Amino acid sequence: SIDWEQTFRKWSKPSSTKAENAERMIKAAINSSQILSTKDISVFPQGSYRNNTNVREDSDVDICVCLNTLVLSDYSLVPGMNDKLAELRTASYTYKQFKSDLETALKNKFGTLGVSRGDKAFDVHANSYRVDADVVPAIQGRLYYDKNHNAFIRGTCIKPDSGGTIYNWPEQNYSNGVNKNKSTGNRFKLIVRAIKRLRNHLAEKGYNTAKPIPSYLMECLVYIVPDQYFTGDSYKTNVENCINYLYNQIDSSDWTEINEIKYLFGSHQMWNKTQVKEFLLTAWSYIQKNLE
């Protein structure tokens, strides 16, 4: 027997200074770089630690280092919009030089043994500064919605070493999560944590359906569930409402990420709605009562 109400209430508990320490140490690594200290660079958390949805004690902090003066624009929505109308200035400093200089600064502060270069981010681990971070080099990304040099949504843009382009909207993710947590009486992020820990519990116990469901996907999926299903006094009922809605609405769905900009499913995502439906069925079966 399992008191799933009690288990979901315990799994909804939050963790505060980890993200702040990571940001401060990466910022200090940048400020000690001669070339990067003069640049217009922002350092800020993103992901679960930013959104207060982190549930694993040993998970890395997602830190974004954004060079704000390099701009990459998505013109797909506005016919006629281009660099000329957007007043894009040509720049000598490139994304590769920025990433290489950031790698040099990270190695300078934290040591080469603690810095590893990946396709998208740097894996940083330095116990001397208590830093366990995924540090993403990004530039200013824009999504225009009108033929006007200011009519755009601003986020971050990543150029992986293996080619291609990626757009992130960390501020939008954060603010949308904050607003949904406000309109649900802080139950939204509680249920996010509970369901993420449910997925982790299922993955550790060998359920294959829980393996390809990462944290950000869970946060997006739970954000999609309407607010009416987060009311009441039973956390288990909220989890079951979320699973029911997501399971019976996903086939006809045309959902977006929590930023309400990027589509949740598509060629740009490594997940598909079949995996999500299978995981939802597994979780539902796992939490039911009187099941032999």
Author numbering: 2 to 16, 21 to 297
From the article:
The native structure of LpCdnE was refined to 2.46-Å resolution. It differs from ClCdnE in similar regions, with 1.32 Å RMSD for 276 Cα pairs, but the α1-α2 loop is missing. LpCdnE, which makes cUU, shows 36% and 34% sequence identity to ClCdnE and EfCdnE, respectively, which is slightly higher than the 32% and 31% identity to EmCdnE and RmCdnE, respectively. Despite the differences in local regions, the dispositions of the NTase and helical domains were similar in the native structures of ClCdnE, EfCdnE, and LpCdnE, respectively. The four protein models, two from LpCdnE-UTP and two from LpCdnE-UMPnPP complex show RMSD of 0.56 Å to 0.82 Å from the native LpCdnE for 281 to 286 matched Cα pairs.
